[PDB]
């Protein structure tokens, strides 16, 4: 059964990544980007409660 | 019901203040501290989408 899917894709500043990770975070969060963007997103996740 | 509490032992260093401000999820916030400290905390929250 398909669950809720919410997608946002823009820069990592202006209060986007933090709120996006805080919202709709239940299980199996997918990351899909290039090397540098993946490194930045995972660093932000480590700095946050994810 | 309250979710958790945040201490902010450091004087806004070590990047742990962002972690403590992001780990909360309640819609009601009762921040209380010195004038400039409160101003900078709420500015960081605004830049963090809080």
Overview in brief:
The structure is cut from a larger assembly and holds two copies of chain A (50 residues). With 50 residues, chain A is an all-alpha fold.
Helix content of chain A: 25-40%
Figure out the total of helices of chain A. Answer: 2
Q: C-alpha Rg of chain A, in Å?
A: 11 Å
Shape summary of chain A: globular
Q: How many β-strand stretches of chain A?
A: 0
Oligomer: part of a larger assembly
Biggest sheet character of chain A: none
Order of helices and strands of chain A: HH
Q: Roughly how many Å apart are the termini of chain A? A: 25 Å
Give me the secondary-structure category of chain A: mainly alpha
Strand percentage of chain A: under 5%
Protein name (chains A, B): Glutamate receptor ionotropic, NMDA 2A
Family (chains A, B): Belongs to the glutamate-gated ion channel (TC 1.A.10.1) family. NR2A/GRIN2A subfamily.
Subcellular location (chains A, B): Cell projection, Dendritic spine; Cell membrane; Synapse; Postsynaptic cell membrane
PDB class: membrane protein
Detailed description of the structure:
Chain A is mainly α and 50 residues long. Chain A is 38% helix and 0% strand. Chain A contains 2 helices and no strands. The longest helix of chain A is centred in the C-terminal third of the chain and has 13 residues, at 35-47. Chain A is globular. Chain A binds chain B through residues 15-16, 18-19, 22, 47-49, and chain B through 15, 18-19, 22-23, 25, 46-49. The PDB classes it as membrane protein. Keywords: nmdar, autoimmune encephalitis, membrane protein. Cryo-EM structure of GluN1-2A NMDAR in complex with human Fab5F6 in one fab bind conformation.
């Amino acid at each position: 059964d398909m669950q809720n899917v919410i997608t946002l894709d823009t820069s990592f500043e202006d209060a986007k990544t933090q709120v996006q990770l805080k919202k709709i975070h239940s299980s199996v969060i997918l990351l899909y980007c290039s090397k540098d963007e993946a490194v930045l997103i995972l660093s932000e996740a480590r700095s946050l409660g994810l």
